[PDB]
Coordinates of C-alpha atoms in Angstrom, one line a residue:
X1 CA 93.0 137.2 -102.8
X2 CA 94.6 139.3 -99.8
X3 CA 94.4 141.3 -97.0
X4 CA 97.3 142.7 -96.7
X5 CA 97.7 145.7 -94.2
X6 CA 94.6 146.3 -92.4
X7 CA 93.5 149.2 -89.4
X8 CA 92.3 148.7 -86.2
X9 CA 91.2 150.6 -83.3
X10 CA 94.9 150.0 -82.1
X11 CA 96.6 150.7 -85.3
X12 CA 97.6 148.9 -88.7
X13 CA 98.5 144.9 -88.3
X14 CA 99.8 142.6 -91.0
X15 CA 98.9 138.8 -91.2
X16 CA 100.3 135.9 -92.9
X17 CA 98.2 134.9 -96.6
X18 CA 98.6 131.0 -97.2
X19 CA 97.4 130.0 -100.7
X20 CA 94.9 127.1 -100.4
X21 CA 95.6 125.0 -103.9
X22 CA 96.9 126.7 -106.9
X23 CA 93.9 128.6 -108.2
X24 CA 94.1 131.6 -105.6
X25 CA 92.2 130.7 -102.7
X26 CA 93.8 131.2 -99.5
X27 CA 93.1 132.2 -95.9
X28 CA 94.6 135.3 -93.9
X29 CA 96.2 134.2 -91.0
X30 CA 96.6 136.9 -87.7
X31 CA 97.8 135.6 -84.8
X32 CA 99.5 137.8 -81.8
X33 CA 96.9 140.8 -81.9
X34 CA 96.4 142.4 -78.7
X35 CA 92.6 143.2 -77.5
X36 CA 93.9 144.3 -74.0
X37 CA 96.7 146.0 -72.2
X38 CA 99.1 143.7 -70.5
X39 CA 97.2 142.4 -67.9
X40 CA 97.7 143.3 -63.9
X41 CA 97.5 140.9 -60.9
X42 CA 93.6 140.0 -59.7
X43 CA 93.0 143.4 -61.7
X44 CA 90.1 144.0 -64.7
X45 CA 91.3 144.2 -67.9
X46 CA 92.3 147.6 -69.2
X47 CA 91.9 148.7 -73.6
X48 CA 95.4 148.5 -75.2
X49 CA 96.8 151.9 -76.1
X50 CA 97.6 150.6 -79.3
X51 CA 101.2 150.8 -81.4
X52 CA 103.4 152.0 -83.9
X53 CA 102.8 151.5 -87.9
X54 CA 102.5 148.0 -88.6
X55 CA 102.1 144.8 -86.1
X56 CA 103.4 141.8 -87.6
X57 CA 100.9 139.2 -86.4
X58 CA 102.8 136.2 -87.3
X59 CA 103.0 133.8 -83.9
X60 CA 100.7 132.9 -81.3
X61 CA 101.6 134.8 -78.7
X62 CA 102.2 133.3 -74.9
X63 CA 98.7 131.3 -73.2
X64 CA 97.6 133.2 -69.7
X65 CA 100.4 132.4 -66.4
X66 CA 98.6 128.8 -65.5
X67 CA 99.4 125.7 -63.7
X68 CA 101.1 123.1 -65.7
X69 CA 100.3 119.5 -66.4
X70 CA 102.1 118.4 -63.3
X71 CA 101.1 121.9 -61.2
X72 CA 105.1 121.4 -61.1
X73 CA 105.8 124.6 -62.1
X74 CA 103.8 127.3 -64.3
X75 CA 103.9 128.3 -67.8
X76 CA 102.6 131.4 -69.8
X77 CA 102.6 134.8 -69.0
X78 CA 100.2 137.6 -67.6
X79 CA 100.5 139.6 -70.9
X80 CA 98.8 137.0 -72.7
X81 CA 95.3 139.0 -74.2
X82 CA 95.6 138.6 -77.5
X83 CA 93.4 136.9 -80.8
X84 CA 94.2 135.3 -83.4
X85 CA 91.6 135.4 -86.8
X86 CA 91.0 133.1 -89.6
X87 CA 89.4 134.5 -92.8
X88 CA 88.6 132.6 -96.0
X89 CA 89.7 134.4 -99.1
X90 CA 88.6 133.9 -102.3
X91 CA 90.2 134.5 -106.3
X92 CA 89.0 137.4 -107.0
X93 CA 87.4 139.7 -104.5
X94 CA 88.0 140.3 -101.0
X95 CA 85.8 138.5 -98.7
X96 CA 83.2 140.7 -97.0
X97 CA 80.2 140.7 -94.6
X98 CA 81.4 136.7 -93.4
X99 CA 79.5 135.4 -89.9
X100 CA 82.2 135.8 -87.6
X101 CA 82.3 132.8 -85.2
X102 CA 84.9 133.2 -81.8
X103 CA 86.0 130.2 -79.9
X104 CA 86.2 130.0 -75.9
X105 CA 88.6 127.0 -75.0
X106 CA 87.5 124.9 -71.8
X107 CA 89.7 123.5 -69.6
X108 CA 87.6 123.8 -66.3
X109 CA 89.2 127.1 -66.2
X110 CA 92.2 126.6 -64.8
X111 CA 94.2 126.2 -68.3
X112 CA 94.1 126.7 -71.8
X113 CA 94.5 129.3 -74.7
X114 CA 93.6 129.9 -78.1
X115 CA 96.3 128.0 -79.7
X116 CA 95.9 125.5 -76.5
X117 CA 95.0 122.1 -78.0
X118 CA 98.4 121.3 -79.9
X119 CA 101.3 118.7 -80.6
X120 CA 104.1 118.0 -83.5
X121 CA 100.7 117.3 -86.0
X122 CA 99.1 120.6 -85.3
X123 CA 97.4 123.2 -82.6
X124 CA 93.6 122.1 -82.6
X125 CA 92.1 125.6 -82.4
X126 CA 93.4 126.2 -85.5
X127 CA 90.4 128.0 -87.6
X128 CA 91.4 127.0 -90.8
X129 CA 89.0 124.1 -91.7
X130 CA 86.6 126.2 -90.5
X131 CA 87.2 129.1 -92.0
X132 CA 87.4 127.7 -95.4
X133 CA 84.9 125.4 -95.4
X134 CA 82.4 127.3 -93.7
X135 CA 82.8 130.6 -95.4
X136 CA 83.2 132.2 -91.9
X137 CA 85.7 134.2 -89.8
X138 CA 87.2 132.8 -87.4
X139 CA 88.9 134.4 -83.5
X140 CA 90.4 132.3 -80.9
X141 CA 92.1 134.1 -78.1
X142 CA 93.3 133.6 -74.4
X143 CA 91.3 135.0 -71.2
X144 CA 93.2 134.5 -68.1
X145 CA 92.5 131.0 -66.3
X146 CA 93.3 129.6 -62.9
X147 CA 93.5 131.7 -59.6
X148 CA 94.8 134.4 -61.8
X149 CA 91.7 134.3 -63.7
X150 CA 89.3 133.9 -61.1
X151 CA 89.9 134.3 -57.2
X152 CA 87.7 136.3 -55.5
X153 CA 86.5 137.5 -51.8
X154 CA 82.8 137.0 -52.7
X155 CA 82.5 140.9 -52.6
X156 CA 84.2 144.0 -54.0
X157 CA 87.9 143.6 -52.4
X158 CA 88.4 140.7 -55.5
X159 CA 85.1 140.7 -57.1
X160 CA 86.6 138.0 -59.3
X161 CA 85.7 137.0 -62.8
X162 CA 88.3 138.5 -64.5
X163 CA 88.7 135.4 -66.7
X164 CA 84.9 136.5 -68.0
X165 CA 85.9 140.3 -68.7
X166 CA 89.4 138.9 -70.8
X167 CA 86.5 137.4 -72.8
X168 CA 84.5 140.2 -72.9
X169 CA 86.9 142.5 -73.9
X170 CA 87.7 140.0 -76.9
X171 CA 84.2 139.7 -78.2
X172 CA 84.1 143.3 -78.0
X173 CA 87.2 143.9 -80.1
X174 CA 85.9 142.1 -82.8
X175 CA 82.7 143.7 -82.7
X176 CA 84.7 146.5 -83.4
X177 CA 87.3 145.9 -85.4
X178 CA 86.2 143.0 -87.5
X179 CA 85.0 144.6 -89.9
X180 CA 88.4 146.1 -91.5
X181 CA 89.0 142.0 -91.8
X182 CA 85.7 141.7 -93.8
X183 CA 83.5 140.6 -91.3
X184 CA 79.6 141.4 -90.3
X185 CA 79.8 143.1 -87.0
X186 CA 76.5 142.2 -86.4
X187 CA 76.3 138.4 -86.8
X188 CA 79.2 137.7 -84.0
X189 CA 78.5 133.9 -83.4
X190 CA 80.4 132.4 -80.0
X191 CA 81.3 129.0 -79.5
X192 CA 83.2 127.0 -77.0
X193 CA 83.4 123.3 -75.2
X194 CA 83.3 122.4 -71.3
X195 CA 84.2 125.9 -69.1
X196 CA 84.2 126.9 -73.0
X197 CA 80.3 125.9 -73.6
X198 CA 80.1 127.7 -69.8
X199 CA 81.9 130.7 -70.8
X200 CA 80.4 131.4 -73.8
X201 CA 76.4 130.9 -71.6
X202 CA 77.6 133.0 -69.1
X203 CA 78.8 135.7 -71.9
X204 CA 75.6 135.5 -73.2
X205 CA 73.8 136.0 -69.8
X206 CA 76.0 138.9 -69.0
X207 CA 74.2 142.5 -69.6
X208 CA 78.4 143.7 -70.6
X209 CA 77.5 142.0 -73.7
X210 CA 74.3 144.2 -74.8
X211 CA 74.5 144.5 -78.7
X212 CA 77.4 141.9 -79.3
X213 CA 76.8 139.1 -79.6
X214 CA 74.4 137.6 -82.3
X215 CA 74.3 133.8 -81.8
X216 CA 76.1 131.2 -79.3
X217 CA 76.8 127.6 -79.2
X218 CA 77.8 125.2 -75.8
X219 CA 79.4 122.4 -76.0
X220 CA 78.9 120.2 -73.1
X221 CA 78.6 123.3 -70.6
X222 CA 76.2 126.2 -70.1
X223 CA 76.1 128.6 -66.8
X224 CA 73.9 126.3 -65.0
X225 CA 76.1 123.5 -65.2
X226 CA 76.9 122.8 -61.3
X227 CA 80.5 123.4 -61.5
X228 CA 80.3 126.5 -63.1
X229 CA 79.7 128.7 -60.1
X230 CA 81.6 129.3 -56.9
X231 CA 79.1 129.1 -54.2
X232 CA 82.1 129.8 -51.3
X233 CA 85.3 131.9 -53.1
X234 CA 86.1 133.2 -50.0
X235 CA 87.2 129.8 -48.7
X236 CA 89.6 128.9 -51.5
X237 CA 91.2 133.0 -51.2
X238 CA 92.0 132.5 -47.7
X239 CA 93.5 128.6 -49.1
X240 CA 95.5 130.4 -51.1
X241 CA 96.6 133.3 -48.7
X242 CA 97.8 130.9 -46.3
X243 CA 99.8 129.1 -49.1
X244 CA 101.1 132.4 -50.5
X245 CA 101.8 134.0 -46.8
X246 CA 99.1 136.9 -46.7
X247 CA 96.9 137.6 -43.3
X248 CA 93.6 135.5 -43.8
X249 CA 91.9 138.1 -41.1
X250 CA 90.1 141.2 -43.1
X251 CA 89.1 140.2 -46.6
X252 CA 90.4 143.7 -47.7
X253 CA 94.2 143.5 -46.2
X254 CA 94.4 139.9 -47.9
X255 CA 93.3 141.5 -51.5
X256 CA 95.6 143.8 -51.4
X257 CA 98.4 141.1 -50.6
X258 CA 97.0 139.0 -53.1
X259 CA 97.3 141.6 -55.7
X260 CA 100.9 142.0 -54.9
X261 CA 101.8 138.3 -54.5
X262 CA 104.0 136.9 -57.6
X263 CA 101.3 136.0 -59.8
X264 CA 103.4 132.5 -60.1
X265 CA 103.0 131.6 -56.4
X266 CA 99.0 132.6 -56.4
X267 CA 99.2 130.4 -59.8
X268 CA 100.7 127.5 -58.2
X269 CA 98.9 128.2 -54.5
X270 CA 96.7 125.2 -54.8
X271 CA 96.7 121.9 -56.8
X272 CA 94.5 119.3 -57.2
X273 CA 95.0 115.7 -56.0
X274 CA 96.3 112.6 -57.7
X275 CA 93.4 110.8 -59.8
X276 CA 91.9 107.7 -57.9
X277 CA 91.0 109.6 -54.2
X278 CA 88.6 110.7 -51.6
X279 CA 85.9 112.8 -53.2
X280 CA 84.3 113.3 -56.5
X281 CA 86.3 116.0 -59.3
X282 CA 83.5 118.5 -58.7
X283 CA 84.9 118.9 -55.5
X284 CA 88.0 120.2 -56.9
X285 CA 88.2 122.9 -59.3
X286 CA 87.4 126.3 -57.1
X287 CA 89.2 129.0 -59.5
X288 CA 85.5 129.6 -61.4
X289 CA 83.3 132.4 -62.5
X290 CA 81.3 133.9 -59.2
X291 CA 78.0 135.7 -59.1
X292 CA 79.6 139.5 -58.4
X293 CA 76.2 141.1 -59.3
X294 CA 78.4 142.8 -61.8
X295 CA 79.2 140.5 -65.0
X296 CA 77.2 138.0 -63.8
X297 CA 74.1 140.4 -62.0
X298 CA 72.5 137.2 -60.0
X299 CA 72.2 133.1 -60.5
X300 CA 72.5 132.7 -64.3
X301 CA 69.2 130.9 -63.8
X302 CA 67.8 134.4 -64.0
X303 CA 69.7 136.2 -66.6
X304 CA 67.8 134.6 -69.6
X305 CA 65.8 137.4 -70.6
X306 CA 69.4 138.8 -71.4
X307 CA 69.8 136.2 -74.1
X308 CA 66.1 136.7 -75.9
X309 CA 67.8 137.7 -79.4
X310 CA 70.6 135.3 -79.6
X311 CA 69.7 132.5 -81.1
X312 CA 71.6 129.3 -79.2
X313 CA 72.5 126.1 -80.2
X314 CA 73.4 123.7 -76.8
X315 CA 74.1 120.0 -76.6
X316 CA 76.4 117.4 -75.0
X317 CA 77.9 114.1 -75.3
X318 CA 76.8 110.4 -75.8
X319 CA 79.1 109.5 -72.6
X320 CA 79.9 113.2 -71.7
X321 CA 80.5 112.0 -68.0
X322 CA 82.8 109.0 -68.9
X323 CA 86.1 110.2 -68.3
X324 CA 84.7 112.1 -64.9
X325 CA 82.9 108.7 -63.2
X326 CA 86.2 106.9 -64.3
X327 CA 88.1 108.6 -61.6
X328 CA 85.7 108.6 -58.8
X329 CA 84.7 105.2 -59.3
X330 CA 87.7 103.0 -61.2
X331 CA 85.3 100.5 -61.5
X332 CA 83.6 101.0 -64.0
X333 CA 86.3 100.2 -66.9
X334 CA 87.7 97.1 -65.4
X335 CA 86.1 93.9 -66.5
X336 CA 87.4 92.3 -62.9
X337 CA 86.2 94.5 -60.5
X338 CA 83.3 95.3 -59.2
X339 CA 80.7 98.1 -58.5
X340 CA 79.2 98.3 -55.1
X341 CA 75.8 100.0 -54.2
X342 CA 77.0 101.6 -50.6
X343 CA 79.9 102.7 -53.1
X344 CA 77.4 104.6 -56.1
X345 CA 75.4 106.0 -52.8
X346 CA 79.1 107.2 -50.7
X347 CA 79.2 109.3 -54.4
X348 CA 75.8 110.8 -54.7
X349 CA 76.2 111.6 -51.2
X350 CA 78.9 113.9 -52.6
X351 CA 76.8 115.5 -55.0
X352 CA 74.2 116.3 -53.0
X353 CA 76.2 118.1 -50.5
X354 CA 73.9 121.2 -50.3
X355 CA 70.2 118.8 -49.8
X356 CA 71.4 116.7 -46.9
X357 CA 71.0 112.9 -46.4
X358 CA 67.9 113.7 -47.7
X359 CA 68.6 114.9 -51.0
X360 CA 71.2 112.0 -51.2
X361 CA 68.0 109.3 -50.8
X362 CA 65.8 110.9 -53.6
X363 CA 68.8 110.6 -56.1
X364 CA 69.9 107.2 -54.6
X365 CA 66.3 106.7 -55.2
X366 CA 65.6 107.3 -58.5
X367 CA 69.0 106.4 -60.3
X368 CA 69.1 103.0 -58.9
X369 CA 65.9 101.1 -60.1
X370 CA 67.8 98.2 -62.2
X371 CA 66.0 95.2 -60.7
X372 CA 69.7 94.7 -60.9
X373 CA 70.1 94.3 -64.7
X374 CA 73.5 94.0 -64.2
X375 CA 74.0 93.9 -60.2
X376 CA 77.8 94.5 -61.0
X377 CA 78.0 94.5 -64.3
X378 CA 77.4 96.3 -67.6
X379 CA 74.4 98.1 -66.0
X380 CA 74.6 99.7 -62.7
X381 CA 78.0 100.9 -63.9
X382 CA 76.9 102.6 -66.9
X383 CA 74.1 104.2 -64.2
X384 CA 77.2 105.8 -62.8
X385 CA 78.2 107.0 -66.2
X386 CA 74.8 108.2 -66.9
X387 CA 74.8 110.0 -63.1
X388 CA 77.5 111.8 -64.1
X389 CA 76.9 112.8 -67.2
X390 CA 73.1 113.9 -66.1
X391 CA 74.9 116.0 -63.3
X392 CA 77.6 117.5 -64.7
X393 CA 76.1 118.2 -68.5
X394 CA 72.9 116.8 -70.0
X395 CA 70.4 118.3 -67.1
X396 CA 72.3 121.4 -66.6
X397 CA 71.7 121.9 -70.5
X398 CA 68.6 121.2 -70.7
X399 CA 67.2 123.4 -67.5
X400 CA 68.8 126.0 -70.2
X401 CA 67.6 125.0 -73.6
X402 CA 64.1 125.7 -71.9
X403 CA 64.9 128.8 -70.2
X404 CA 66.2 130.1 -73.1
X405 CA 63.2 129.1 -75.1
X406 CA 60.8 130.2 -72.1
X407 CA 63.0 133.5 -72.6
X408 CA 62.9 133.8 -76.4
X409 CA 61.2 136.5 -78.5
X410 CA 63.6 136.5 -81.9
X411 CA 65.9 133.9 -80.6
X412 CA 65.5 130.3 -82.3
X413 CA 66.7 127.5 -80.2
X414 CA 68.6 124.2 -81.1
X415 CA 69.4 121.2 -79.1
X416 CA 71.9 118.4 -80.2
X417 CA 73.6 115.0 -78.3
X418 CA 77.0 114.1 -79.9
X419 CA 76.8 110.3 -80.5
X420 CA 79.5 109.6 -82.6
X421 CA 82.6 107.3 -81.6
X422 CA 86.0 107.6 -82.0
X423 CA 87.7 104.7 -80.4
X424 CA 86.0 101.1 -79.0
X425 CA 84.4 101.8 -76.0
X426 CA 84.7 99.2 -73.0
X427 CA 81.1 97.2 -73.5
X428 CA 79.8 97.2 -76.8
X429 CA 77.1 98.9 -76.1
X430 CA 78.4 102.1 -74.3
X431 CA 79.1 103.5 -77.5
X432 CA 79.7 107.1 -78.3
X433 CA 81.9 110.6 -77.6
X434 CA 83.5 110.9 -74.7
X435 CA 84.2 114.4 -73.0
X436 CA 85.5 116.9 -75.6
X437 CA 85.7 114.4 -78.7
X438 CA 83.5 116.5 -80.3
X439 CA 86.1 119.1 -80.5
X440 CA 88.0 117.8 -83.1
X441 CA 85.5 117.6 -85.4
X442 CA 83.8 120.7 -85.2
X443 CA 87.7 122.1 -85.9
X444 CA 87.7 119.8 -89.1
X445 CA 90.7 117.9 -87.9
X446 CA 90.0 114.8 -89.9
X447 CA 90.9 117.4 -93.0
X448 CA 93.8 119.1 -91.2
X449 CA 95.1 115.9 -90.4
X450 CA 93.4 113.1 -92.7
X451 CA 95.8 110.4 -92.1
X452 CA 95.0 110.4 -88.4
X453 CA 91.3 109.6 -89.4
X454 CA 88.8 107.4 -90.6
X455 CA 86.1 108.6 -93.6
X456 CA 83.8 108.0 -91.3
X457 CA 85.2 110.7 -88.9
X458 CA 85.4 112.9 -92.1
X459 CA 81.8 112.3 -92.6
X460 CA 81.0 113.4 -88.9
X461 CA 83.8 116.6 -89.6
X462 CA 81.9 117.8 -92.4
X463 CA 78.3 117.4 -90.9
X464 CA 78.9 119.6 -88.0
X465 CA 81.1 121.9 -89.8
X466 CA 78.2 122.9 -92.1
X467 CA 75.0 123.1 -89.1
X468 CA 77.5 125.2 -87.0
X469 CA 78.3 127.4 -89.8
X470 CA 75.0 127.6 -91.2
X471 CA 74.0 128.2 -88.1
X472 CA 76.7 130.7 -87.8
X473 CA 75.4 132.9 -91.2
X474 CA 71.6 132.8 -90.5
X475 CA 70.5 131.6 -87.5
X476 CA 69.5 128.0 -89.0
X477 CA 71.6 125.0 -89.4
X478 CA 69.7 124.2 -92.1
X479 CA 70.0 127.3 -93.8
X480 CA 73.4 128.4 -95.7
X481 CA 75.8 127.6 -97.8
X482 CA 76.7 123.7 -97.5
X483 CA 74.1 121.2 -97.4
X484 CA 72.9 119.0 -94.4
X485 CA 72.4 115.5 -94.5
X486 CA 68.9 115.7 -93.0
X487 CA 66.8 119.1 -91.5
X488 CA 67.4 119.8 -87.8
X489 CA 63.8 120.9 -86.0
X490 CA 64.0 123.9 -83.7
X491 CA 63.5 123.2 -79.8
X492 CA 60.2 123.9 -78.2
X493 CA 58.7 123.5 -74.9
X494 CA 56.5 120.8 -76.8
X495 CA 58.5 119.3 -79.0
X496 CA 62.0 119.8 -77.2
X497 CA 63.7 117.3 -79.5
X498 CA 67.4 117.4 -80.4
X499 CA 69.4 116.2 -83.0
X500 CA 72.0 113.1 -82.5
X501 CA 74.7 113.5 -84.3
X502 CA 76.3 110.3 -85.4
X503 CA 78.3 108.6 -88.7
X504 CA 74.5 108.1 -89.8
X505 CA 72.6 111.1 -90.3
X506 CA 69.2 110.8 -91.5
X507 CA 65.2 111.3 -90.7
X508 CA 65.3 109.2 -87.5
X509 CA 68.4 111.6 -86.3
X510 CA 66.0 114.0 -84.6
X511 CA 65.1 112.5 -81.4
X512 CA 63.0 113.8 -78.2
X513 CA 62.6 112.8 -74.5
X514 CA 66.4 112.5 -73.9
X515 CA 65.6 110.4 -70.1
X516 CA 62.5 113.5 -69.1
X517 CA 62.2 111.4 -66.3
X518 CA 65.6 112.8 -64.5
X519 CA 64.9 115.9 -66.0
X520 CA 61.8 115.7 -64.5
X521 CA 63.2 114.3 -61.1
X522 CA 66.2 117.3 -60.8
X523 CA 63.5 120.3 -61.6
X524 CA 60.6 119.3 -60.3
X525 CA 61.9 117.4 -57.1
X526 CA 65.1 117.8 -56.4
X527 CA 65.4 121.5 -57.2
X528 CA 62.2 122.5 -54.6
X529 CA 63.8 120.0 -51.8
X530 CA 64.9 122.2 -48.6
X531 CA 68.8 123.3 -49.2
X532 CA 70.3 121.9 -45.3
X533 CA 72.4 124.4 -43.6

């Protein structure tokens, strides 16, 4: 079938129809629509006053004004709010009432956009495989990233968080308009990966969102994820005003600089070190979401009641924390060197900053019992994997699958651990996903792009595509219109189990315990331990 011309809020807008085979399936294709005015320095995102007849949304449009690879130069541009939608069309009717799911890219926040992930094979936000096989709508778009997206004072001057209201403003867009496209306003499903999985929690938590959103999904992030919040903006401003030239003095004379600074210098104010250094990542990235009691009212730890009807779906990664202990301890990959215990304590020293010395022992404490395994060797170095990825993801996620159970009235809640692998790991045991890998199969690349693939990967593709989407139309991954290889059990407080996704799904998929005892450590412990000052 066809779309064709369609109306919204800000006039008509024309996509591009790509047949899908020869029988007359196909997919409309918008890309380029604006869901906000051109966006203003350090300013909140204003409605778009709409156009002219008919926008030709053929082309991605330009990704937020962000830091390069090299934080060489930048690349993008501050008039960069716009979506791009996916919708699966049949051969006869036009398709009508479809879940509508919206992507938030990661990227720690500091880059990224909805076309982001790409190369000379293809973008990997592209909705397509999802759209089609999943019977759903789908909406990427760009929120501003980056000091752009995020610097704040700490208090009204920059209340910061202008990344989160770009989302916002997205999410409400469709709500609004996504219907002309054949969607269900009322079954908007949100899903992201890394500040992406963050983004979309914290969207959830937000009491903006009242009456939006229907269901969410985080990959490998949620709001409580420790790297999510800025404890100290103030600090990295006054970095950047230095850099840029404005007075550090009054936190009011330096906003107002700030908001008149070329958004390229502010962009490029501060960059982060080479890779094998002095601290731990965390350390690094400052330009994140801050609790303004405004979008984000207080911690995120107590905004759940906010997300009591939106049923959630939240996992992580086999070896989510790989690629992150790699770089503060090289170690770890190199079958010649070795792993030293004043070195694993000089790094949860780091990450126990805010619980003093004391803090540090209790962690150094509890993650260290090896009776020396593997002194050196294939164990105490995958403890420093498994400290990082506790950290950073799998305790973070799970203090939230509770709280959002503890929370729930409607909502149903769904835990999952992405298991599979995509290349040999180091040791043959540490086998698994590393961060983000599970991105590409959630967008059906082993489809887009089969030849880059193995079936197995197509097997794992095709699995999650159907829970998500399922998940996506009622609430259940189990429940819709493409089968499951084996039935994924709710979370509970009791049961708590999750499902491990892997080449190889069956009964024994749906697991429990995932290491309670840290869990238990971090919440009961850790958590209550006096915060040094």
């Amino acid at each position: 079938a066809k779309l064709g011309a369609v109306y919204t809020e800000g006039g008509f807008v024309e996509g591009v129809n790509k047949k899908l085979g020869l029988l007359g399936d196909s997919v409309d294709i918008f890309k380029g629509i604006p869901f906000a005015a051109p966006t203003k320095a350090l300013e909140n995102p204003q409605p778009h006053p709409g156009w002219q007849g008919t926008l030709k949304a053929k082309n991605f449009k330009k990704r937020c004004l962000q830091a390069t690879i090299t934080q060489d130069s930048t690349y993008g541009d501050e008039d960069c709010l716009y979506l791009n939608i996916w919708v699966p069309q049949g051969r006869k009717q036009v398709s009508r009432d479809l879940p509508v799911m919206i992507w938030i890219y990661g990227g720690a926040f500091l880059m990224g956009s909805g076309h982001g992930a790409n190369f000379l094979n293809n973008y990997l936000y592209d909705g397509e495989e999802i759209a089609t096989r999943g019977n759903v709508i789908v909406v990427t778009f760009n929120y501003r990233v980056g000091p752009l997206g995020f610097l704040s004072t700490g208090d009204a001057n920059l209340p910061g968080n202008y990344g989160l209201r770009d989302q916002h403003m997205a999410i409400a867009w469709v709500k609004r308009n996504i219907a002309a496209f054949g969607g269900d306003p009322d079954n908007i499903t949100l899903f992201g990966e890394s500040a992406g999985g963050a983004s979309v929690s914290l969207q959830t938590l937000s009491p903006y969102n009242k009456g939006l959103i229907r269901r969410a999904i985080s990959q490998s992030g949620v709001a409580l994820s420790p790297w999510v919040i800025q404890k100290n903006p103030l600090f990295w401003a006054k970095k950047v005003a230095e850099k840029v030239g404005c007075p550090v003095g009054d936190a009011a004379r330096m906003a107002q600089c700030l908001k008149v600074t070329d958004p390229r210098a502010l962009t490029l104010a501060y960059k982060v070190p080479l890779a094998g250094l002095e601290y731990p990542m965390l350390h690094y990235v400052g330009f994140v979401p801050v609790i303004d009691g405004d979008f984000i009212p207080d911690d995120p730890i107590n905004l759940y009641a906010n997300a009591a009807d939106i049923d959630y779906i939240a996992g992580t990664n086999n070896m989510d924390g790989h690629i992150f202990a790699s770089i503060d301890m090289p170690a770890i990959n190199k079958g010649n060197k070795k792993v030293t215990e004043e070195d694993f304590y000089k790094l949860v020293s780091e990450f126990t900053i805010t619980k003093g010395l004391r803090g540090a022992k209790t962690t150094f404490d509890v993650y260290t019992e090896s009776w020396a395994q593997d002194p050196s060797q294939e164990n105490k170095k995958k403890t420093v994997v498994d400290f990082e990825t506790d950290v950073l993801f799998l305790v973070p996620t799970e203090i939230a699958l509770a709280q959002h159970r503890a929370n729930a009235k409607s909502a149903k809640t769904y835990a999952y651990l992405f298991s599979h692998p995509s290349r040999m790991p180091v040791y043959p045991k540490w086998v698994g996903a590393d961060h983000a890998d599970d991105i590409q199969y959630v967008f059906g690349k082993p489809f887009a792009t089969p030849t880059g693939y193995r079936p197995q990967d197509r097997t794992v593709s095709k699995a999650m595509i159907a829970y998500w989407t399922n998940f996506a139309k009622t609430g259940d991954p189990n429940m819709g219109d493409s089968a499951v290889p084996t039935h994924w059990e709710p979370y509970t407080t009791e049961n708590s189990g999750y499902l491990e996704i892997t080449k190889k799904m069956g009964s024994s998929s749906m697991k429990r315990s995932l290491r309670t005892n840290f869990l238990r450590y971090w919440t009961l412990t850790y958590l209550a331990l006096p915060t040094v000052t």
